[PDB]
RNA sequence: AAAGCGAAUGAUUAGGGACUCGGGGGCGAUUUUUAGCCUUCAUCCAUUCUCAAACUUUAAAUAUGUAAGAAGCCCUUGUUACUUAACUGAACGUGGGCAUUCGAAUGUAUCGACACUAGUGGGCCAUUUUUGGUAAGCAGAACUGGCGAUGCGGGAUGAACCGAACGCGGGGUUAAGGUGCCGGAGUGGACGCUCAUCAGACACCACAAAAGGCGUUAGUACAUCUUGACAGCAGGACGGUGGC
RNA sequence: CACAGGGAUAACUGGCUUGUGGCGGCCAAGCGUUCAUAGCGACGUCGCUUUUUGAUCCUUCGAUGUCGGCUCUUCCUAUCAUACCGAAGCAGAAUUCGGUAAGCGUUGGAUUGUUCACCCACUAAUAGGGAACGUGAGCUGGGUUUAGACCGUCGUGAGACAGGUUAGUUUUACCCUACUGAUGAACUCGUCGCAAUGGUAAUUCAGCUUAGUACGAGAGGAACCGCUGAUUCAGAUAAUUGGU
């Protein structure tokens, strides 16, 4: 419940000698609509001569999963500076939504890499249709057939509160 | 104690630009100056008489006296915690009618036609400006003009 | 003399060349800048590779003649006399400063202390920035592994951080490789000293028909 | 500031074309300027790799001068020894006309002028910009904010940092900072990484580098493989031809 | 020689820095009979330390006793010897490079006031440093640095010299703490016991045998076990010898 998708258009303020400007199209995940649009004239300003003082924003529309109750595999492209240059990668996922991929790339990149948030280009979000397209062998071993396996030495849940038990707990649940 | 002396630091500011040098075009003496003009300064290091102070090079103030070949100007100086008024003496070829006046001399003659053709008829008008508001609602077509999908870049070496 | 290079890393003073303002300053220790086969024609060498900075800092004339012999040796002995060009592309011109305490005032007397303490030339070092390239080689195409070799070696005299790029041109010019071979092929190009020019379609009609009779017919 | 040098003034790397009467060395009789055959420097021409506090064709950001009416605008015409060939002008005005709107925004929690006099005239610190010096808790400047002259909550301590400036009390909510115990408040929730016989643990700040690891984790590129790839084990390994 | 002051300002410790001094690394042209790395390391380049000397002037000028030696305790490791080991361009003997390791030692003298130095001789060895450049109410007073005196150079002179020489008063603990020892109120007076915590101790060499053996063409030439003594240190004791 941190992001969501949405679709921003913009536009250059039309004028005299070019009446009826182009438009352009992104997809933002954001966590509100205030910073989906400062995040669009970021973008928006490193491929055309726009700017924010010189533009209009046209609609800003939330853009929903189709299916958020089917299990898919979405694979990620992204660039991301480190503390000496810049790379490209390509991770993958196994969830029910779009932004919850993205959510977990963003605590993955965090923890692997220690990339913040101010430091990635999200390039493209796709879910990969068949079986054969999955290619991380961490994705595969949950895809196999006939899965299932136990859990074992588990620990039982107590309060807090409850101090001094009289027994020694299990771990069989 | 530094050197300081009358022209000191001014190698760029009297100097003329470049492909500038030579002739002084001749509508400079043929000007007409009354006392409560308002002008500009700007010294031109080709003629060295009559030269002001390299404070009031690019200064505006007001004529309060005319000579055969000079006028006076008022200028204001600002000497720590006051204002000082100074009156200084240049010859016609480092002065300049301004223009900073032009759009208040301009504006009163066209509100006094308009308050005039507006009592003449009977429609009141506004008469002063107003800075500029916040846009206002419309509608934008799609037709034809169907918008383009814009994704970021991967990295990439260019040398 | 000669303090160590830690003492001298930071470009912590404006540019202060060798003029008629500062007389007496010794001659830098590099002398020579381009090894090699320097006069190979252009579509010899197709291959080009680049040493390129990573930080803003000043570099020693003589860790640039370090490096350059060394990586010098190592192509000469792999690859022969005529199977490469180098170029170095940083030259020394910001000169630094030594007070000398001891000379000055040990032994000396005079004036001790703080008084008095601007310096006397000493050295010369070359000033770089994030991205600059300091040393290209250009070769063919099946000595790609010595080219990189090479480079790698002569890094260990330099103080802070670079890397090793693979061009996208070909040789030393401007040119993307694919559009290059495309222009030759128009005949838009000819062979000058081991480089080339192009034609613009600017000049008058008579000489440039001279000189790219190729590209009209 | 940035930028420029196939743009002036300076600095600077490398080839090519044209040239000989400029130099040097030579070869066809060194004959010979015979530019005969060459030759290397030099010169001119179109190109080529790097620069400038006391260089420049260009050229920002931040800052800076003046104006936004009634002491204004327009119509007519009175004085002068100044000016004009000339009541032609120049300055100062009578009379008349113009809110049907006195001519951008916001504030006005403080308008103008005068009199008499105290203390001070050793300063220091910080972000950004900066000079000398290898550097310094060193020495010197610009704009602004602080301490001195100032308590309170944090940084265990700590003139200058973060939050916030103070009459005597009661209730509520917070800032910076915190919630295993010392200690008021979570042994709170989600996904990963790390095993150190020298772990690590919060701005100013109380330090660490070049260089290495088949420790572990993620990624980039190329090549081989169910027409059987890597590892291990098992078998074979032929005529000219003992090549000239 | 005098007075008013100054830590706004030098001469010693301490504090920041580390140019210079000292110590340690990285790369690999080359040396090494062939052979970059057994043992070394040119051109370059990254560090550490505060037992050198500089740079600064924060504390002390109503005073923190200013060289060296003697005496005594403890700490550091960048290891001279001793324990157990890895490597060699390690046949044996002798040597060289490296690891764990500060438990235990590291001397008797001629000249010099010396710190520093240079010789003779023994030894397993004669390593490097700190503690206000440890240590003057602990000593000493040879040097330096008051007043007397001589010489050389300098000055007209009074006088000067980080130049030589000779003679020159070293004060107070009975107070608090620290330390070394010695008594002791309260719960009846005694006899015999336990042991938390604190302290801790040993050291190096030689002779005989192994053996003229192993190894080696020869010249040369070991070691483990076993036996008997001695150096430095510690705790006691007085039959005998010596001193009083
Ligand atoms: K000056
Ligand atoms: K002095
Ligand atoms: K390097
Ligand atoms: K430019
Ligand atoms: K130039
Ligand atoms: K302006
Ligand atoms: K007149
Ligand atoms: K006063
Ligand atoms: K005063
Ligand atoms: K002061
Ligand atoms: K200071
Ligand atoms: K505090
Ligand atoms: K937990
Ligand atoms: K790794
Ligand atoms: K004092
Ligand atoms: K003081
Ligand atoms: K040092
Ligand atoms: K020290
Ligand atoms: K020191
Ligand atoms: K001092
Ligand atoms: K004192
Ligand atoms: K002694
Ligand atoms: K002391
Ligand atoms: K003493
Ligand atoms: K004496
Ligand atoms: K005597
Ligand atoms: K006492
Ligand atoms: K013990
Ligand atoms: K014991
Ligand atoms: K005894
Ligand atoms: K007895
Ligand atoms: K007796
Ligand atoms: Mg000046
Ligand atoms: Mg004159
Ligand atoms: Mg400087
Ligand atoms: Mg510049
Ligand atoms: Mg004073
Ligand atoms: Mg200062
Ligand atoms: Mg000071
Ligand atoms: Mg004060
Ligand atoms: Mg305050
Ligand atoms: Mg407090
Ligand atoms: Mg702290
Ligand atoms: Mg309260
Ligand atoms: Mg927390
Ligand atoms: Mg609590
Ligand atoms: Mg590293
Ligand atoms: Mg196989
Ligand atoms: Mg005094
Ligand atoms: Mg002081
Ligand atoms: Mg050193
Ligand atoms: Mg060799
Ligand atoms: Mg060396
Ligand atoms: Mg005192
Ligand atoms: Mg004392
Ligand atoms: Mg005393
Ligand atoms: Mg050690
Ligand atoms: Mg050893
Ligand atoms: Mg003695
Ligand atoms: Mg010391
Ligand atoms: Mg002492
Ligand atoms: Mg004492
Ligand atoms: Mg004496
Ligand atoms: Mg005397
Ligand atoms: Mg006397
Ligand atoms: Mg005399
Ligand atoms: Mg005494
Ligand atoms: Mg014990
Ligand atoms: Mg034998
Ligand atoms: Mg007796």
Redesign the pocket.
Known sequence: GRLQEYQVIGRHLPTEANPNPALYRMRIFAPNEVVAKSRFWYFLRGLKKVKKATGEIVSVNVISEKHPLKVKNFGIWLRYDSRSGT??????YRETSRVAAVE?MY??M????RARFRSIHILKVVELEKTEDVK?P?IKQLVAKNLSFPLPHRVPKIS??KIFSAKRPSTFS | GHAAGLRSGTR?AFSR???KHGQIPLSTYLRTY???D?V?IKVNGAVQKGMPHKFYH?????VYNVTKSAVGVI??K?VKHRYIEKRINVRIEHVKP?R??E???R???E??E???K??????????????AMPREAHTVSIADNKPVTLAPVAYETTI | ??????????C???????????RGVPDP?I????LGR??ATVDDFPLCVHLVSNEYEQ??S??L???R??AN??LVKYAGKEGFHL?????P??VI???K??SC??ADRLQ????G???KPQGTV????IG??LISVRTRDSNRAIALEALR?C?????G?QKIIVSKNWG?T?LRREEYLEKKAAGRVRV???????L?NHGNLEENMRRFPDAFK
């Open positions: 790379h490209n990668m390509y991770k993958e977990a605590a993955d965090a923890a692997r890499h991380r961490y807090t509160k | 760029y630009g470049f492909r009354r006392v409560g308002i500009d690019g200064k505006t103030g007001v200028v204001y600002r301004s900073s006046r759009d208040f001399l504006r009163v003659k509100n006094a308009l308050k005039k507006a009592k003449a008829e009977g429609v009141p008008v506004q008469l002063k400006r107003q800075p | 003399a000669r303090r160590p290079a830690r003492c001298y890393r930071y912590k003073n404006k540019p202060y060349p060798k003029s008629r303002f500062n220790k002398k020579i800048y381009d320097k006069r570099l020693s003589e860790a003649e370090a490096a012999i060394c040796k190592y170029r170095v592309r940083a030259h011109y910001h400063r030594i007070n305490m001891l005032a040990g001790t202390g703080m008084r303490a601007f310096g070359a000033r770089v920035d600059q390239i070696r890094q260990y005299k330099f103080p951080r030393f401007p000058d000293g081991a480089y080339v020019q192009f613009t």
